[PDB]
Enzyme design. Sequence first.
Site, short mmCIF file in Angstrom:
data_model
loop_
_atom_site.label_atom_id
_atom_site.label_comp_id
_atom_site.label_asym_id
_atom_site.label_seq_id
_atom_site.Cartn_x
_atom_site.Cartn_y
_atom_site.Cartn_z
N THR A 84 0.82 -1.20 0.00
CA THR A 84 0.00 0.00 0.00
C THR A 84 0.86 1.26 0.00
O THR A 84 0.81 2.06 -0.93
CB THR A 84 -0.95 0.04 1.21
OG1 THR A 84 -1.80 -1.11 1.19
CG2 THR A 84 -1.80 1.30 1.19
N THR A 85 1.66 1.42 1.05
CA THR A 85 2.53 2.59 1.17
C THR A 85 3.69 2.47 0.19
O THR A 85 4.40 1.46 0.17
CB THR A 85 3.06 2.72 2.60
OG1 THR A 85 1.95 2.85 3.51
CG2 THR A 85 3.96 3.94 2.73
#
Lengths: 191, 240, 233, 240, 69, 152
Positions: free
Chosen positions: A1-2
């Site tokens: 995600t990040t």
Amino acid sequence: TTIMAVQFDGGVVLGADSRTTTGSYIANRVTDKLTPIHDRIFCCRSGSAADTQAVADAVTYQLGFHSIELNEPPLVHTAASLFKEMCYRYREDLMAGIIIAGWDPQEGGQVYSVPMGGMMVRQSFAIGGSGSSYIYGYVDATYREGMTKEECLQFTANALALAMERDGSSGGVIRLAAIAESGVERQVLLG
Amino acid sequence: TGYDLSASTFSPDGRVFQVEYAMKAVENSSTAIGIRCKDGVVFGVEKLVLSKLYEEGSNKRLFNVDRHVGMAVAGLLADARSLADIAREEASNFRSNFGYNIPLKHLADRVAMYVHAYTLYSAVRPFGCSFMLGSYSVNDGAQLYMIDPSGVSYGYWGCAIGKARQAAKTEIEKLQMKEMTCRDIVKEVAKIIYIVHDEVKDKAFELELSWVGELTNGRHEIVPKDIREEAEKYAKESLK
Amino acid sequence: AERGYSFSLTTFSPSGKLVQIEYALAAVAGGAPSVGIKAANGVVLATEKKQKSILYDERSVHKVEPITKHIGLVYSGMGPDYRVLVHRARKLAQQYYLVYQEPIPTAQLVQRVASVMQEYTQSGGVRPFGVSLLICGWNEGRPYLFQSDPSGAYFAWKATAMGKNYVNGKTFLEKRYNEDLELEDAIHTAILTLKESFEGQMTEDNIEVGICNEAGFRRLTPTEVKDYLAAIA
Amino acid sequence: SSAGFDRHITIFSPEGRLYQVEYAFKAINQGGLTSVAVRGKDCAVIVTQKKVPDKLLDSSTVTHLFKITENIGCVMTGMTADSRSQVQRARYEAANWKYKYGYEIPVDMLCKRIADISQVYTQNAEMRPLGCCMILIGIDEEQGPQVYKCDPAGYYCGFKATAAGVKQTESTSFLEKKVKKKFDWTFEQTVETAITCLSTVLSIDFKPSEIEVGVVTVENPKFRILTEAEIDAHLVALAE
Amino acid sequence: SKMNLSEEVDLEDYVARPDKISGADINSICQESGMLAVRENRYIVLAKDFEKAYKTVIKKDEQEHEFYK
Amino acid sequence: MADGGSERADGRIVKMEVDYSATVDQRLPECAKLAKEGRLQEVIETLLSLEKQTRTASDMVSTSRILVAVVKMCYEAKEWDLLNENIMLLSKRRSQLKQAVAKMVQQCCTYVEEITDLPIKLRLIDTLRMVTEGKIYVEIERARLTKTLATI
């Protein structure tokens, strides 16, 4: 995600998390968010995984047939323009989390961010991910100008650790990617 | 006995009569040449004069397809403007999906696939236009390509089409080409341009010249007559 | 008239015979010999492949191109238009396999392909297939061997032969082969009728013998070809 | 035999023969080129050349070496116009298999999918058969290198060593006796025999800069060719 | 037999490659194969003399079609 | 090349008498590179003869002693080598070997009377293959006749 992208003088340095969570449950514990478009051109993906894979596969087919016919170095800016045109027309359907960061022979290491709107812009650093909301103040301070590939692996580790530990969606094992004239470099770190 | 009818059929000698008639179809047109220096590429066009005929600076075969690319064409003029719009539309697709300068190699390749395709079908007909493609860029350099109606894609440092004089490209090796800065090159080519192509065939004529390269920063335009004026200035005193 | 989209080029002669379709039989006659035998348990095919130069290796190009795991096949005459209908039969055999859920018999391959092959000959602007297909396989416990022609007419023969001197090899397969025999005995006389028009040299790469077992088609490697035929037949 | 207008279109004949297709035999003669393919144990070597009538010829643009895939290249013969239209189609289906399948490409059966498009060219109502001849190399896993030469009749063809064209008929005559007997093949052995097989034909034996020797050997699987450097060293190595 | 021996020259290779290009062009081209021995310049006819004789007549142009063999 | 053959050969003539035979063997690579080019027409015929001139001047030195003719079988080693890399194709300019061999057998004419027949027949067995390589070319055929009459 990040996801994270940092560019130094002789290339760019990328990093991303592994653990990806759908709802409360964890979909995958280890996932590589970097996309091997070409040796000199990578990108970091987030959000929907199905939308990021096919678009990366489309440009791989588009540019692949084009770049092999060129017999020329893999220009980064033109590859990101293919993402700019597609994410702009499909902006009402597809979700764009792609940020193009790669080293180019003529233009050197460059980073191009393409948000959900489909626009393309060049900056000295790139940010992304759901857990990036807490590190917005940390990324605008610790970051320095004229970074070196050495400390880029340290700085991207500081930006991911704060986002992965705080936010619940991001987490898992830390994986970094180094891009330079010497070729692709990857490593696995934790803690 | 009729083997030249269908453009989709071969010939008893094993070639395409439609192309053989198309090769000499460009030869009957007035001469349009081209040459490339180190930092630039030079174009030229001859304009014949019979009666008047009309206003000077009309229907010039020199066209500008793109920023860094240009057209020096010969043969039937209407077929050239059609290829000028096709190359313009192809240059529009490249500046849209990508947004940078179209390389001259693949720009000639796109047209090479077109001109070749029309020769394959008997429905359509081959092209009577043999043109010149050349360009210069800071990240590319000066290249010049010679395209023929048969569809062969390639290029040299220079080529000549149109009328059969061909003596206007002879003195170029007697002068400095790749060493020169492309500035004086304009007036150095035009010397024998006036001498040869004698006035017995055509009493009067007119010359057009175009250039693209570093001095224009990649831009292509026809060199004006008033600036730098040394084009036709040195051409009149070099006839001897 | 009309478009120019290739309307039918095939007309009728004053006697009613087909013009360009009968000329495709000349390519079958001017092709290479191919033989097959339907006897007892299964069908056996014997083809002929000889290299025009010593630089050709037969291990790459294979004459036998089985349509299904249980269905073998061979051809005669003319390649370029042969692979078109082959892969077309691969896509066409799926509708019967997906909808009816069953290892489609060779008889249904005959009905569907020869209908399209006849429609291909009816369509003009294109040259008809100069390929005579021998369709074989095993279905419902009883195998079959079927022979088609460029015109699309399908026949059924115990032992059949095509190519140069096909009428002479047909009489040999009528006499030497009769009633039904085992696949081992079927391979024997299939090579003997192939050695008729064959040259004075027979090796593993000169002849390739396909066989359709009741268990389904199995293509024999050149190994077993040189083992049984050395010492041909 | 011929009856009616059959001479003027592409179809069969009253005797079942072909005319158009057989006129493509000498369609290569206008180019007047030669390509011979030789394959070794772990290696495969292609030999070609080019003609330089004028000093304006550019070595890069008139280069006859075409690279389909990084691992697998190719070469053509005959008129270069029809070859280029087949170049992208060889690149097209390539990228299709790289995308969808994701591995080393149909090193064996790729000539079937290419000849299928090449047959569509021949099977079209009125269209040019495109008499250009396609020649490919190949790389597979533990199969050794591969060599494939396709002809524009719509069929797939390839073997160990194959040479077809104008003068290639006499080149295969030496390769039949040179390979076997019984012999092995090393890297330089296939490069040295690339000239000797042509030495039975013409081999004017001049400066190597005009001739281009394609080479593929398995160390790094990626196909590639040097420039002018050790090709001359392999030319002086075979002659002692 | 009317040619000079040919006790050295080995007929094995001349019954194969020249046999491919024969017209025929049968009977007296074989005499031309001997009439290229008078072209020599050599006491016992070289292999290049035979091969050169048959290859001129008559030429063949192949192969886009008969390849089915 | 013309100038390349005159500067290297005339500079190596001092190595024969003054210097040792090591430089005579070290003279092979440079003189071979001159014949690798083949700039011809008749120049290299005269250029490489200057080698063969002092090389026959070394025949006075070497072939006398020391000794056993092992130095002569090293001469045919670079006689065959001199024809290897040119390749000269029985030309043009192959006459550099004739006058050489003619002067080589002229020394053999002096050797048979000066020295016993044992070392010269090992020298004559080497030139028998030199004539097979020397054709049929001009006088080399009759240089065979004068040496074989000496063997009788």
